[PDB]
Amino acid sequence: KIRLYQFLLDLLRSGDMKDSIWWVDKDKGTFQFSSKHKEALAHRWGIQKGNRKKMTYEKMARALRNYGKTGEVKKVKKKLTYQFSGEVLGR
DNA sequence: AATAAGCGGAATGGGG
DNA sequence: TCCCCATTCCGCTTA
Ligand code: NA
């Protein structure tokens, strides 16, 4: 099954949900969610995963925080903004 | 207050 | 057994 960080990277590459997520500085790998349209993206993640409950941005961001220590995604000190690692971007 | 983002400990669930 | 990779729940903090 696809990992959350890969799902997000794939969306940014395809542009399928441009009103929910976008690059801020693509060369640096920083990206940001839409305040008003992030829940539709979270819903999509849960449906793709086949999860029992409806996915919310809160639960998706809880999973995102677990990447902080391994490094695939880190929180940036800007509203709704995160950053992929060089390793993730290179693959 | 209302609204919202951000946090993580802990319990629980996936699929090896 | 016991790690993988989350998901779900809850209470708290910060803006
Ligand atoms: Na967030």
Round and report the angstrom distance from CA (A69) to C1' (B8). 13
Residue with token string 């992929």: A84
- Length of chain A as a residue count: 91
Beta strands in A1-91 (DSSP E): 21-25, 30-33, 73-75, 81-84
Cβ contact A7:A47 at 8 Å? no
Rounded to whole angstroms, how far apart are CA atoms A49 and A55? Answer: 10
Rounded to whole angstroms, how far apart are CA atoms A33 and A47? Answer: 18
Range of the domain at A47: 1-91
Pairing mode of beta strands A81-84, A30-33: antiparallel
Q: How many domains does chain A have?
A: 1
For A39: left if phi > 0, alpha if psi spans -120 to 50, otherwise beta; the answer is: alpha
- Using C1' positions and the CA of A2, the closest nucleotide is C5
Query: What is the identity of the amino acid at A82?
Result: Y
Beta bridge partners of residue A23, listed in sequence order = A31
Give the resolution in Å: 1.4
List CB contacts of A46: < 8 A, sequence separation 6 or more.
A53, A54, A55
Return the structure tokens found at A36: 């008003």
Pick out residues 4-63 of chain A having their CB under 7 A from any atom of nucleic acid strand C: 4-5, 45-46, 49, 51-55, 58-60, 62-63
